[PDB]
Symmetry: C6
Subunit: 216 residues, 6 copies
């Protein structure tokens, strides 16, 4: 990664194993993405590829990921074209799609772009593309649909709500969505026992209010 | 986090795993909060969101947390309004509710606010809001009420007292409360055998005095 | 903690877990205290409270601890009074009992006192108070009395001596005491077989001398 | 390895054990190579030999590796000859094949070449040769042929695709190849149930499109 | 410990646990001493006491240790007396026996002595005294006598030799002794089968020579 | 060890445990030697003795090691004599055999020799002597002879080759030897089934070629 002068430094073995072990244990649950992002702070494209390449298995997901990167790389090339003339020896060349992905660019060039003034954030751009691909994978890997998440007759309300927002996080729900969902759908899939109470609270009720009410 | 010049540095993988493992093992017992606070020393809002987002499961608690942050963000916006004019290129903009929560602010802006002279402590303000939400969750997750914590006929007094203050800590008791509780309620829920002795000590008796007396 | 300029630095996650795991495994055996002291080198009151607050369970001991701190805080206030006038903006205020305990003082103020010339060692003063409270807890948590520690007919002398000084350490024996104990009480609770030999050594005999003699 | 002045520093014990444990657990699965590359960032030939020599077992693979290095060393000597005159005391000598491999060169000389201006990247050249040898080993160690990777009548499409690209990665498929393979061969080895759908998508279909279609 | 200006730094939690775990696992086998010495490089008397005090159990050994320190402290006081006049405010006082042991001296004073020019090596002197006490403990804790270490009729010679020098190391054998022992006693306690060969080698024979001869 | 000014620094607890655990698990397999060398980069004689002394068990090997060091120390003294006059106070004395081994030299003197300009590499010289002794031990500890390593009728060729070069590495085979061995002896100890094919390849055949041929 890059760290403060701004200097490249090689990825740590603890960071490498941390990421690999998370994928082994968690597969593609939603929380793996913000963990990925955290372990990859200030990461170059090489660092990012290193983290992705070190994962054994889930090679279907890894292939789908490369497809998403191609689309973003293609769109980048459309919005950011570059001439194919002779490269100027003194100063850096302009990065195209595959350079940001780290397939057609050296570590020297990646550092050059990230540490320049003003910097070309090729690591931030590429991480962006990866999170987009990882979100597609989480969406696809989500076991259950939100419609099949309903409170069991003898299930604690807290457990039902945990499964509800666990599922809802996997299915890529915006806060706009999540907030409407809690108002609408959360109540309707609850127990008849619970739903009787929950209606009594009526409108705008907090999840705090709802969960204390149905503790019974 | 921010560390001494005051510079941002990326959260460590040991800190990340430390927090995640504590939630896996302890769930929402009272001691998880001061641990959270310790692992998040000098943390930016991004760091704080990273720590919260990396937790898998307890998504009911995570939703309730976001609700508490909205309330604090709303109250912040009331007490600290800002104009919607054109942003001055040279100098920082003024942070509103969602900027402190890290949803509508970049890492650059978060560092800018925290490292300024005088600093706008957006990390300390946001951590404040989170602890308030976490305390609500601990309160709700507390298994037993203090009224059901009573000394068993064949239970050591120390074990009874451990359960008593364990429960009492979860139910959000101030030192004002805790000190009155030890005087009043601790004695009344003890064994008849013990209570006979404990009264003999009478008033103002220490917990040290009480525990040595009932060792028998 | 504070480290060399003298600068505050946040407690490490390895130090935090180290302390928590020691309490989980050892409870309140005597050796937990010098371990506590070692993990808390140069610790501020906040650091010290962090270490104490992170411990789950033993909440009876934690309450007794707070009682000991109140007594030391009260005695400190008696011996070190302070005026309740307006606080001088430029320079630090004088610390009272609860400021040293970290309940009524900020981290800024704690650093200010510890890093001043001359320094007000609020961390050393507070650690002092804590060790006093922890020693009370170890004393109370000691399973057996020294009088019930006697050599079994078929017990190796080394094992008997280990239990003897293990118990004796828990019961808060000064070196003045320990040295008299080895002369007097250690010999009398030994086996008749052993005691026959041990008397033969007579007076001033070393533990080295005693243990080699009874190896048989 | 070499790190920023550019200075040699000895390989870490965490890095050493990290590499050894990966070989113990994973043997020669494809992901071991980018892990090797990551643990060996800025590595000297000595560091690289240290990492290779510390591996117990797979001595057949280690021998094949040395054979690949000889070929690259021989080709290097052909393309980069050097005179056998007297060595100039003041300045460095020119590196030949075995010097890059670290068999006939000291650590001093390896540092000298890597830290010079302009540098002779003997670590990068040697790592290159090693990855070429490791890829030969992975190819040979691949358990199954891509032709025997077919979707079982009662196998989830995702599992079939994971085995497909797992196998395909071991057999050294270029992106040129992989992209043609997904178009052609992936579809033909699927279930009759699946293949009926997959054809319906027809041409250019994404793996994202294919996997959602056959989720059924 | 003290490290390079020469500055005190607090003992690490990894070093603390490393030492504690070694005593838990190994008890007082000979190799524990050079491990102790290594974990205590540049250690102050406080650091040394911290390491000794953190050990739970073996309190018989810990008591014997304190007895050895008293003897060395007493001998130090005899050979290095000091006046009991008023202490000079500006400059350090002269260390007596208990000051080196860390019982009657502060950390400030310990640093003062160790970092002075010329330095008074109170850490090296005290470590010296401790190793002397630890060697007494290892001697006493040695399970078997060298006379009972004999080669079993069906025992490999290597295993016999391992037990021989394992025992011999515990019983505090100098190289003067060890070298005479290999010549004399090692041969006589071997098998009749082996001893027939071993004599054939006769005088001055290496352990290398002896072990290859009896491999049969 | 010594690290960049060139300064001594105390061996790490992670390095110490790393070495000890490797000997516990691997005993004296060939790969333990390059691991030893890696953990001991820039090590002083004290560091080297620390690493050797911390090993519990294999005391037969440790004794044989000391014998090899004596021989190298004796040869050093022959080739590098020194006068027994009065030592010059200002400047370093010249190191003799036992000084390099760390038995008759202080840490100060060891640092003095290693950090001088020009340096006397007492750590490199001593490590040299140790590897020579460790290679003797590996040779002796090798379980099987290369003559008894033959391909089983129903054994995969890869497994046979792994055992072949595993054994061959223990028996101290030079690359001159190893390369002749693969040509000659590897083929003759293979299966009749395999040997029929392997001859067909004939002369100069690679191990890569041989292993792919007999995969069947
Ligand atoms: Cl790869
Ligand atoms: Cl793979
Ligand atoms: Cl997230
Ligand atoms: Cl989740
Ligand atoms: Cl708390
Ligand atoms: Cl608790
Ligand atoms: Cl080797
Ligand atoms: Cl091997
Ligand atoms: Cl103590
Ligand atoms: Cl103890
Ligand atoms: Cl030793
Ligand atoms: Cl031993």
């Amino acid at each position: 990664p890059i760290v403060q002068q701004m200097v490249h430094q090689a990825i740590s073995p603890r960071t490498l194993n941390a990421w690999v072990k998370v994928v082994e244990e968690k597969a593609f649950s939603p929380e793996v993405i913000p963990m990925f992002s955290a372990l990859s702070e200030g990461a170059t494209p090489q660092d990012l590829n290193t983290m992705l390449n070190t994962v054994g298995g889930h090679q279907a997901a890894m292939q789908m990921l490369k497809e998403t990167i191609n689309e973003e790389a293609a769109e980048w090339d459309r919005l950011h074209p570059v001439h194919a003339g002779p490269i100027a020896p003194g100063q850096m060349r302009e990065p195209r799609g595959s350079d940001i992905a780290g397939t057609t660019s050296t570590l020297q060039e990646q550092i050059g772009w990230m540490t320049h003034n003003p910097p070309i954030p090729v690591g931030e751009i590429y991480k962006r593309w990866i999170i987009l691909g990882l979100n597609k994978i989480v969406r696809m890997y989500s076991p259950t649909s939100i419609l099949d998440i309903r409170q069991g007759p003898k299930e604690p309300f807290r457990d039902y709500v945990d499964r509800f927002y666990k599922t809802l996080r996997a299915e890529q729900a915006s806060q706009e969505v999540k907030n409407w969902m809690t108002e609408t759908l959360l109540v309707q899939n609850a127990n008849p026992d619970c739903k009787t109470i929950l209606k009594a609270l009526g409108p705008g009720a907090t999840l705090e209010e709802m969960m204390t009410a149905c503790q019974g």
